[PDB]
């Protein structure tokens, strides 16, 4: 697994591929680790799938809870806050097997600069946090490799757009030495998925433009 | 006198009721919509509960902002016990009129509110908007058109028996709603106004705002 | 005054049940047959309980729709720690009298409801279909052809003490009871009808919708 | 008597809120102001919340220090919970609604209070001062410029509905104040002062001590 | 065991073997390995018996249940979320020895194509789902040969009947490989069960297409 | 009658207060003086509760001597979870008026007692003694000069409105405090005496016994 | 009728005290000398409690010894906490007027019962022998001399009121004792003594048998 | 990690790094651990980053929270109670991987001579403290250098800027040994943060004035 988060200008882009693997055994093609938890906020998912799933379906319902409730969205540090109790929630569990770390990626529409709205919060096993505030960051098996790789292609971020590139060059890295991560699957079509956020909101990035991107970053380098 | 007691409680409640503000909730053309006086800026009467089902309430506040609560409660976890789709405004009706049901009998004094419960059909689909109105005692009906609530309802009510416009318009149901609210009695850009827009993909609410809705408010 | 309490507890529940609109339960050819006035196209006051047991209930909706779900609750855990044909309707009438019998008693303020559970033969099997009615402090009996409750019931158990076909047809009887129920009072497709039908396999319920509906119903 | 048992208990406490000495907050150009005759050197009433939210409280001591208590609690708690920028003291005014409520039915005696919660934008944020009364039944209102509690309150607020200078300083609302306080009865260094400065960083609370408050006191 | 799940233009098809092992001691010859849940849902199940057995029974009565009391049967992913809830509630007995993985195939009425109404969702020891979207799956410890086995022969895949003989096929060469599955007994007349999905509901393939289907299968590679 | 019940309750205490005997607390150079008569060796009415903070109570014994070691208890607790230098007396004050509120809501006879906390600064440091005093019904008042309680108090607060020598001494304090006690009525060496000596490095309580008493005690 | 109510408990109380027989403790040379009239061979109203602390009591039996063996088992646990040298009997009059306290306000009867809780000096050390009176509504006092209790207690006390001698002998005091307690009302070798020997190393009780008894009995 | 505490002859001066390792591997380069607990208090926290931003964070809202309920705020003696209990608190978790330990520093604006009313705390895993009164204390992988250093160093204190550059200077010479530590980043512009206390209150220290004086040792020791 790899998923990954940008930060461009405008806001930012998180994307992650699709592979599930059990062993060394391909037991899943298509999976969607990448979450629209609520307008603002994209929450992505590594480890352990039925966790990953719960935290994500789960998140989402609290962030919606707090709103009906309180007639207000959490403030992004509530938000990161209320995640990073789930994850410790969690402690026992991943001590067993049951393991799984988010990586969250969001705009606040409150930040003084809307050019630096965008926000990238890794988090950890034990629910600490660290806001990255350095334009990339990743979680997964391969998020080893895309950091790095994502360390080069950095400065070509200009735009939306433009990041979305980096992104799927990234994971199209980790893919390429992570044999858990899965690059994309022109022979059957599967690619990808992303999320990009800006003021106007979150939105799923059409397979269109990823897998166009993909064949581009494939012939390039083929 | 258990019999005459159930009687003095009722008699409390309804008064209670009755010197509270008005609010009414009508099915028209875009789903439902939410009209009630409101002073204040702050304390609403008209709120979400899941997707396509929506509350608004007349009384004391702090009790019915707690059983709104509690909806949105109940909803919730519903919601994340089978599936979002599974939640039905009938349940949340049902919820309700068992709470005030039990509240009428258990606790000390009886809740001066009154309840209505909307649902509109999901995005794609289309389905007749369905109403709800739940009393102080627990008892449940459902109006195929419009409802009213808090104070005196006669006037109002009666307005609307005509006033209705089977499939108005959002300004035009709108219109019909203030007017018929005016019967019972003003009527400014200061009041609460939401609608439940079938419309809309996924949260069918929406809160009318100030600006916007004066391009679409009655003149008196 | 012990005594003269219970004839209070009594009489508020008879009030009530009075109030409330009216419900009918039959014997027929196919089984049993259901049908009461309800304006509501949601608040059913006919379910299914188990496999080959029914529910029906007229008064307090909030009220029965509780003991409805208990019931079921009852049925299903019952089922599934024993077997499914080890659940027999008579067992569901005892629970209910029994609960009833409490409420009557330990709550406040009495249910205002009459509840009827019926239960007709396995799909092989034939046998007399069966009727059984609880009423508000507990009581319970069991009618051989026809039940009644909710509003005014002479003039429609009248109505019934004649034109009870012993083996009517379902569009039969259920022009005999739509008849015998416009007696205490119209009766449009706008009410609830549903049936026992123990020529179905398993579950030996079926409701009947609105437009299958008038290809049986009675000219008025 | 279900009814005329909930009229005692608003008179008993209505009574001993009047019996109680005065307290006023209304809103001016640095944000919130609180002012109240305390004689006592240590018993306040008015307190800290939250970051930007600030308490204030007319009638029986041990009874509404409780409710500050509960509130510091309740706020604290949220923060952390979240986030110190997701309590609101609407939020606030809700739980004391709420918590007033239950007690004027569940507790023997109801509380003798009446409180005050405001609420003034963060620091580079502008947005109007907001103010809340809970009275002890659990009703709430939000005034838009000034609140009155305790004793005659008429003589106290009808100065008010004159003398408020919409956008006035902190001295000249100071004035403003201890003026229309003094028209329900003197006023001297003697009493309890105390702000809610939106120019403040984080904390927007501050006491006015004693030498510091002579060079804004009013002149009677 | 193996528990096939096939998915075709009108709807889908589930089949089974009946083979119950014990060490490697063959203790059961005619087990009812698939199951019809509701009118549009049928569950097969595999690993330890006695779990496999109490899965169906309760799963079948908790939707029923729900109908009955709220007057509407659930969402398909209403269905999905219940029986992966329940598996989770059984991960504690599952890390000791009662391990039971279920396979969900159902035809969802609310479906927007009618002709892509049919649904395999497969399940994971700790309670997550993958819809699965690619026609087949299997579950049991033939049915990684089944899987594989099916993989080519699913282009025949044209109608009910025509699925369903490639089902009953890969049930045939996962017996052919898994000793724990257990092929069609003829000297005793034996045969996988199966079930059948479309917008008419679920119901028992009689034993006669699939005897029939078996001997086909068997006289073609003898 | 919720309103008329309260007033009972109070009758009953003040009652039991006025057949008790009287005890005084006044401000004196050294600290604060307690004096209160007492005929019993065992059964004290003044106490210490922690370092510069003591404890004097009239009414029934068993009732107040309870409340004492209350105090003792919170006191105690309070200094361990944090430091002794955290303990006020106006939080020991608070507590009982907590308590003694609820005391005279929840429990079925309200207490027969009146108590006076007083505190007086730490060693190095100067600050003015402070002296509460807490009310059967939870009332909390604080007297910058001297505490009367116990029986008629009028003509003991009386005289004391005029004897009352604002920095006094100690035999002077006496003097007057047992003089002015009289008023109310003899005044033997048979009583109770402690003080709050200020100038006492930590624990500021000092009993003063029978032959040390004689040396600063009042000629009648 | 909260104060009303008190007055009826303190009467059903006060009178079941009068309707009981008598008992009497005294200071004594020795220590402290216990006589009751008890014509039961078995049921004592006079009983050990601790090393040096001794009980005696007058009205219902079941009351009393309950309220005794409470007192033995707090003695006895007090002890092992801490030393049997820090157990008073001032300690266990306070736990006493605590629980009949409790009691004549929680208890639906309050107790027919009233206690004397008597210490003397340990083994060598000289120490005034102490006596505490507790009464059905937990009031606490320590006469210094003698204590009477049970029946019609004036003409008992009054006799003692001139009989008592200061330093009696244990056969003197006996004698004044008995002739005191026929004063009241014959006080033959069937009734109950016991004494607190003083002169006793550790466990100061010593009942006072049959034979043994008449060599100190006096002549009526 | 290092943390750093100074007193001084007006106050007292704290200052630790940013760096936040996992294994033999930099997942962190500007983490703040130094936190102004309230008006007159400075906490700063080593070990486990989920733990210590938890204390701090923790600890800053019961100190506030007394003081909004009492009016006044706590003792000094107080609140190192309050931090030593919280410690205590932890030990459970501390025996198992989660440990974190804190370092206090304050003035007391209530000592007999306020030029003594600098405070330095050092807390023990079980939830003892010992007030240093020796100038300078240290927690953190490194602390033993700093110490050590620091050691040498302090007759150069002599007032708040002159003791804050000792400070920075024991963090240099901490991570010049404890590769857990890190130093100042001149190709990042990321330095050391640091919090001054003396009768005024607690002010954060511009990274201006560090960035310098770091710039300054870098060079001598060049
Ligand atoms: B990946 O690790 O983000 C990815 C996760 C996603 C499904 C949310 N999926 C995995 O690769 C898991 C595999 C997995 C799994 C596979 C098949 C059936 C059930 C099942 C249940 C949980 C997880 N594997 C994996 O590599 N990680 C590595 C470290 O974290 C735990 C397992
Ligand atoms: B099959 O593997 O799913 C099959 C399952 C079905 C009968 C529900 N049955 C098995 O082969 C089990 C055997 C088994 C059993 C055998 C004999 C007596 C009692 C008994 C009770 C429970 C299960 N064996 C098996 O292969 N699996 C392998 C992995 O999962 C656990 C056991
Ligand atoms: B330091 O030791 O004070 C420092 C502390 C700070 C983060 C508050 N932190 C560390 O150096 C940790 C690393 C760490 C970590 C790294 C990456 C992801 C999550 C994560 C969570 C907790 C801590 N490492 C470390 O050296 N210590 C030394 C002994 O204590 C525990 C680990």
């Given at each position: 697994?790899?998923?990954?988060a940008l930060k461009?200008?405008?806001?930012?882009?998180?994307?992650?591929?699709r592979?599930?693997?059990?062993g060394?055994?391909?037991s899943?093609?298509?999976?969607?680790?990448?979450?629209?938890?609520?307008?603002y906020?994209?929450?992505?998912?590594?480890?352990?799938?039925?966790?990953?799933?719960?935290?994500?379906?789960?998140?989402?319902?609290?962030?919606?809870h707090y709103?009906?409730?309180?007639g207000?969205?959490?403030?992004?540090?509530?938000?990161?806050?209320?995640?990073?109790?789930?994850?410790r929630?969690n402690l026992?569990?991943?001590?067993?097997?049951?393991?799984a770390?988010?990586?969250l990626?969001?705009?606040?529409?409150?930040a003084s600069?809307?050019?630096?709205?965008?926000?990238i919060?890794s988090?950890?096993?034990?629910?600490?946090?660290?806001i990255?505030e350095?334009?990339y960051?990743?979680?997964?098996?391969?998020?080893?490799?895309?950091?790095?790789?994502?360390?080069?292609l950095?400065?070509?971020?200009?735009?939306?757009?433009?990041?979305?590139r980096?992104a799927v060059?990234?994971?199209?890295?980790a893919?390429?030495?992570?044999?858990?991560?899965?690059?994309?699957?022109?022979?059957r079509?599967?690619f990808?998925?992303?999320v990009?956020?800006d003021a106007d909101?979150?939105?799923?990035?059409?397979?269109?433009?990823?897998?166009?991107?993909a064949?581009?970053?494939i012939?390039?380098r083929? | 006198?258990?019999?005459?007691a159930?009687?003095?409680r009722?008699?409390?409640?309804?008064k209670?009721?009755?010197?509270?503000?008005?609010?009414?909730?009508?099915?028209?053309?875009?789903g439902?919509?939410?009209?009630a006086?409101?002073?204040?800026?702050?304390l609403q009467?008209?709120?979400?509960?899941?997707?396509?089902?929506?509350f608004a309430?007349?009384?004391?506040?702090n009790?019915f902002d707690?059983?709104?609560?509690?909806?949105?409660?109940?909803?919730?976890?519903?919601?994340?016990?089978?599936?979002?789709?599974?939640?039905?405004?009938?349940?949340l009706?049902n919820?309700?009129?068992?709470?005030?049901?039990?509240?009428?009998?258990?606790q000390?004094?009886p809740?001066?509110?009154?309840?209505?419960?909307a649902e509109?059909?999901?995005?794609?689909?289309?389905?007749?908007?369905?109403?709800?109105?739940?009393?102080?005692?627990?008892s449940?009906?459902?109006?195929?058109?419009?409802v009213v609530?808090?104070?005196?309802?006669?006037?109002?009510?009666?307005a609307?028996?005509?006033?209705?416009a089977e499939?108005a318009?959002l300004?035009?149901?709108?219109r019909?709603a203030?007017?018929?609210?005016?019967?019972?009695?003003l009527?400014?850009?200061?009041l609460?106004?939401?609608?439940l827009?079938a419309?809309?993909?996924?949260?069918?609410?929406?809160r009318?705002?100030g600006?916007?809705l004066?391009a679409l408010?009655?003149?008196?």
């Amino acid at each position: 697994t790899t998923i990954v988060a940008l930060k461009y200008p405008g806001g930012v882009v998180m994307a992650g591929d699709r592979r599930s693997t059990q062993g060394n055994m391909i037991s899943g093609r298509d999976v969607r680790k990448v979450y629209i938890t609520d307008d603002y906020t994209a929450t992505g998912i590594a480890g352990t799938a039925a966790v990953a799933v719960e935290f994500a379906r789960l998140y989402a319902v609290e962030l919606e809870h707090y709103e009906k409730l309180e007639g207000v969205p959490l403030t992004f540090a509530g938000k990161i806050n209320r995640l990073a109790i789930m994850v410790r929630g969690n402690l026992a569990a991943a001590m067993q097997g049951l393991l799984a770390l988010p990586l969250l990626a969001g705009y606040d529409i409150h930040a003084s600069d809307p050019q630096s709205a965008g926000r990238i919060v890794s988090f950890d096993a034990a629910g600490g946090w660290n806001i990255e505030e350095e334009g990339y960051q990743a979680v997964g098996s391969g998020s080893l490799f895309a950091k790095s790789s994502m360390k080069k292609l950095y400065s070509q971020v200009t735009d939306g757009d433009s990041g979305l590139r980096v992104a799927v060059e990234a994971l199209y890295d980790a893919a390429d030495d992570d044999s858990a991560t899965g690059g994309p699957d022109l022979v059957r079509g599967i690619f990808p998925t992303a999320v990009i956020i800006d003021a106007d909101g979150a939105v799923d990035v059409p397979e269109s433009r990823i897998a166009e991107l993909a064949r581009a970053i494939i012939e390039s380098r083929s | 006198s258990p019999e005459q007691a159930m009687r003095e409680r009722s008699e409390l409640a309804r008064k209670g009721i009755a010197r509270a503000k008005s609010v009414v909730a009508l099915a028209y053309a875009g789903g439902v919509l939410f009209v009630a006086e409101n002073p204040s800026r702050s304390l609403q009467k008209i709120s979400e509960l899941y997707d396509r089902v929506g509350f608004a309430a007349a009384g004391k506040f702090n009790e019915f902002d707690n059983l709104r609560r509690g909806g949105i409660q109940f909803a919730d976890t519903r919601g994340y016990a089978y599936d979002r789709r599974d939640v039905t405004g009938r349940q949340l009706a049902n919820v309700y009129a068992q709470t005030l049901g039990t509240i009428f009998t258990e606790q000390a004094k009886p809740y001066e509110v009154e309840l209505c419960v909307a649902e509109v059909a999901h995005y794609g689909e289309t389905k007749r908007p369905e109403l709800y109105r739940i009393t102080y005692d627990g008892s449940i009906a459902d109006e195929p058109h419009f409802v009213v609530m808090g104070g005196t309802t006669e006037p109002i009510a009666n307005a609307l028996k005509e006033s209705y416009a089977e499939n108005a318009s959002l300004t035009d149901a709108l219109r019909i709603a203030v007017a018929a609210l005016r019967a019972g009695s003003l009527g400014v850009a200061s009041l609460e106004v939401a609608v439940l827009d079938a419309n809309r993909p996924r949260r069918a609410f929406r809160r009318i705002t100030g600006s916007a809705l004066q391009a679409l408010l009655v003149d008196q």
